Write a protein that binds this ligand. Structure first.
Ligand SMILES: Nc1ncnc2c1ncn2[C@@H]1O[C@H](COP(=O)(O)CP(=O)(O)OP(=O)(O)O)[C@@H](O)[C@H]1O
Ligand SMILES: [Mg+2]
Ligand SMILES: [Mg+2]
Length: 232
């Protein structure tokens, strides 16, 4: 049956087989859940320090590449730059912190980002009760949860050399999920995606982001760059 030209629907290629992603749900350790509730539902004047804690974590993960090379030189063969990118998306109201540090395995996500008690958590909650500045979070070993000063939901996508790529996600409320992530491979590192609360959109503005990186994160020790989407 001769054809000289086909329409797009006709030559659309069949989909790749659908992938399964395994999902597991976990409760936050009790004091972690308590802290998150405190962080979310209390007014703090100096919420901007969230970005200091996430940059700090990225800088730690990047220093680990430098040091893991002493026990495993193969990391020296990576051509990836050691760096951080800050990516505001005003369309989606997200602020993403991307690094090319060592990343986390599945068990790292579960054990490091919620099910294990930090020994400073109770002390920190008491300090906050007695009126401490929220900036003190960074000294009590629970700085990641400062994301929820500004974010209603946090997704962390991560890939470590020793595991597959995973997504951790929580809207607080007492639990989080970890799921195998078969989507856009991110390569080694971690991306924290902050789904900002409606009153916190200043952290999508490039002037605001530059201001708080200069104020609080001037010794990262790696290049950080801010991607600014061109105004249409
Ligand atoms: N960008 C990232 N890359 C890799 N691991 C990360 C990460 N962000 C967070 N983590 C993991 O999450 C853990 C919890 O981080 P935080 O709540 O900041 C306490 P910490 O950073 O371990 O101590 P510190 O903040 O006192 O230096 C880290 O120890 C690390 O294992
Ligand atoms: Mg169709
Ligand atoms: Mg930290």
């Amino acid at each position: 049956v001769p054809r000289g030209s086909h329409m797009p629907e006709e030559t659309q290629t069949q989909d790749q087989p659908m992938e399964e992603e395994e999902v597991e749900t976990f409760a936050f350790q009790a004091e972690i859940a308590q802290l998150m509730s405190l962080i979310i539902n209390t007014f703090y004047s100096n919420k901007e320090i969230f970005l200091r804690e996430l940059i700090s974590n990225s800088s730690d993960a990047l220093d680990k590449i430098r040091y893991e090379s002493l026990t495993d030189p193969s990391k020296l063969d990576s051509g990836k730059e050691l760096h951080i990118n800050l990516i505001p998306n005003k369309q989606d109201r997200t602020l993403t912190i991307v690094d090319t540090g060592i990343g986390m395995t599945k068990a790292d996500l579960i054990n490091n980002l919620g099910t294990i008690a930090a020994s400073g958590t109770k002390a920190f909650m008491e300090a906050l009760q007695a009126g401490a500045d929220i900036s003190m979070i960074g000294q009590f070993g629970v700085g990641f949860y400062s994301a929820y000063l500004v974010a209603e939901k946090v997704t962390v996508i991560t890939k470590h050399n020793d595991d597959e790529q995973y997504a951790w996600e929580s809207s607080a409320g007492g639990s989080f999920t970890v799921r195998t992530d078969t989507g856009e491979p991110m390569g080694r590192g971690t991306k924290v995606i902050l789904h900002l609360k409606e009153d916190q959109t200043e952290y999508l503005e490039e002037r605001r982001i530059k201001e708080i990186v200069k104020k609080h994160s001037q010794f990262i020790g790696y290049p950080i760059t801010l991607f600014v989407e061109k105004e249409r």
